[PDB]
């Protein structure tokens, strides 16, 4: 799949995730700042909310 990819200190860029899903890691509670998007479906936490997707393509936006 064609998803977004970036870090805490970088800008978002399209990248080919392929078969695996994608993710949108962000601060769980407001300010719900975006901390990173990429391939896969990584674990979150109390502060970190991770939203995974697969079909949409560029869905981890």
């Amino acid at each position: 799949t064609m998803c977004y990819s970036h870090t805490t200190t970088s800008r978002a860029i399209l990248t080919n995730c392929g078969e695996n899903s994608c993710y949108r890691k962000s601060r769980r509670h407001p300010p719900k700042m975006v901390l990173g998007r990429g391939c896969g479906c990584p674990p979150g936490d109390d502060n970190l909310e991770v939203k995974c997707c697969t079909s949409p393509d560029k869905c981890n936006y």
Binding site: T8, T9, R27, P30, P31, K32, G36
Partner: protein, 531 residues
């Protein structure tokens, strides 16, 4: 050539000429003004840049101070226009000078700009802060600098020599001192330095105003949509180290010395990765590492100081935009998004009040809801959307700015207040957001004059009209033409007059969102106190 070479106390510099629809300007970008805060220096107050042999390349902007990059909306201008446009580095303490061409013959008034970004972001190299137009148009020296942000510039362990805090404001000060010693080399006049900044940059300005050591470095101040007394501008020593410790823990650290030592070993990005975790949560318009009331830079709380201060012989220009609040709601307020009119439900509206106004009793929210609710149309979305937007704006920007203005004016200072209410034609944000936070800057800097950009012919004139105001203030401590055009009255604590800044001529109005600010400044306090 010729005047693209200047020698300062530290050494020689090789600037460059920038082109403008009116003429060229001489710009010297990336002048090092402090020894880079690397490793052992990280977290410590800046140290003066040691004299260099040879010539320094001042033809381009230097590294942006290491920071978090707001990736909320990938590929969106309204969001990316503030992102760093240069490489991130801890080695980032550089300043920039824009001087008229040909270099002025007599010492000309200087304007120093401190960018905003909630103390967690920002850079003087952004396109919207390009001095070339304002310098060319008003022929005045313009200086802007880079100051550390995030933990790098504000993480504090109150009382420690390893992580004192406020080093970000110290960077700013070091630059103003550099200006006092070298600005003359560009025809700049050190006896006429006017500071102007927006948001946290305006908050910074206000703190230099409340901090004695900074007082001999400027003569006039301009706070745009931000004040030192805002609920987000400062944090107490308590909170300060609670946060600086949470960060240390999250990053696996470890005695302050022991803690800071460990901290200093962590890669910069590792620290930024956990920056937003330390926030006491549940809110909008709140940033992790901000200035601390340490008793040092700030001998007391901004509020305390503003009240007790004697401001005679001072001229300040203060103002806000038509919709301070809007911008922030999309970062958590339930039902808000840039991708639709965010026509919230009375339900979300009530939950948003709690978001936009953190740490406050349930009864306190009731008081807010009571005031900001139109009881003839309690369920109308359109109004609740504008209402939550006012709550945030008023609480965070308008009422804090309004209060300061009243105190300053009331206590000896000449004050001028404005309300920038004109949405740019090029504006990339939704229409429901009106004239958001930070969208008056592009005009103050005369960006409409830039060809590559599609502004209207009427906006190009507006910007010129605005630049004149700012310049006249810098030069004389008074906005209007030092004529037969609408006059800008000073802001008195009583009459509370200000002018609306749009394409139409100056219109004077009374009351800076007065009815609302009485709630925030007079009542809300008494309420919380008694509970």
């Amino acid at each position: 050539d010729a005047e693209l070479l200047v020698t300062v106390r530290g050494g020689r510099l090789r600037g460059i000429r920038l082109k403008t629809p009116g003429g060229p300007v001489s710009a010297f970008l990336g002048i090092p003004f402090a020894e880079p805060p690397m490793g052992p220096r990280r977290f410590l107050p800046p140290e003066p840049k040691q004299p260099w042999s040879g010539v320094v390349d001042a033809t381009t902007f230097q590294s942006v101070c290491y920071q978090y990059v707001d990736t909320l909306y990938p590929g969106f201008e309204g969001t990316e226009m503030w992102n760093p446009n240069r490489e991130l580095s801890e080695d980032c303490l550089y300043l920039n000078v824009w001087t008229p061409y040909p270099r002025p013959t007599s010492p000309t008034p200087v304007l120093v700009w401190i960018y905003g970004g909630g103390f967690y972001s920002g850079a003087s190299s952004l396109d919207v802060y390009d001095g070339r137009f304002l310098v060319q148009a008003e022929r005045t020296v313009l200086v802007s600098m880079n100051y550390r942000v995030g933990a790098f510039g504000f993480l504090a362990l109150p009382g420690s020599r390893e992580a004192p805090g406020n080093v970000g404001l110290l960077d700013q000060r070091l630059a103003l001192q550099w200006v006092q010693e070298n600005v003359a080399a560009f025809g700049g006049d050190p006896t006429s330095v006017t500071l102007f900044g927006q948001s946290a940059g305006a908050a910074s300005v206000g703190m230099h105003l409340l901090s004695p050591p900074s007082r001999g470095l400027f003569h006039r101040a301009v706070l745009q949509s931000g004040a030192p007394n805002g609920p987000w501008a400062t944090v107490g020593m308590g909170e300060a180290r609670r946060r600086a410790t949470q960060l240390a823990h999250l990053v696996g650290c470890p005695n302050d010395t022991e803690l800071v030592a460990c901290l200093r070993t962590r890669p910069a990005q590792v620290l930024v990765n956990h920056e937003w975790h330390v926030l006491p949560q549940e809110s909008v318009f709140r940033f992790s590492f901000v200035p601390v009331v340490d008793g040092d830079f700030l001998s007391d709380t901004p509020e305390a100081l503003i009240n007790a201060g004697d401001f005679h012989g001072l001229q300040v220009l203060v103002g806000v935009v038509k919709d301070e609040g809007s911008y922030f709601l999309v970062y958590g307020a339930p039902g808000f998004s840039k991708d639709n009119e965010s026509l919230i439900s009375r339900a979300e509206f009530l939950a948003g009040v709690r978001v936009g106004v953190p740490q406050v009793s349930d009864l306190a929210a009731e008081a807010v809801v009571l005031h900001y609710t139109d009881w003839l149309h309690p369920e109308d979305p359109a109004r609740l959307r504008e209402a939550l937007s006012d709550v945030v704006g008023d609480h965070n920007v308008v009422c804090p700015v309004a209060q300061l203005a009243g105190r300053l004016a009331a206590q000896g200072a000449r004050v001028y207040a404005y309300v920038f209410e004109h949405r740019a034609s090029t504006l990339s944000w939704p229409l429901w957001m009106g004239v958001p936070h930070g969208y008056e800057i592009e005009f103050i800097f005369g960006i409409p004059l830039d060809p590559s950009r599609n502004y209207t012919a009427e906006e190009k004139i507006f910007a010129q009209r605005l630049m004149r105001y700012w310049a006249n203030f810098a030069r004389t401590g008074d906005p209007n033409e030092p004529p037969k055009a609408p006059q800008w009255p000073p802001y008195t604590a009583g009459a509370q007059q200000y002018v609306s800044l749009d394409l139409r001529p100056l219109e004077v109005r009374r009351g800076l969102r007065a009815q609302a600010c009485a709630f925030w400044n007079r009542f809300l306090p008494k309420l919380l106190s008694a509970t």
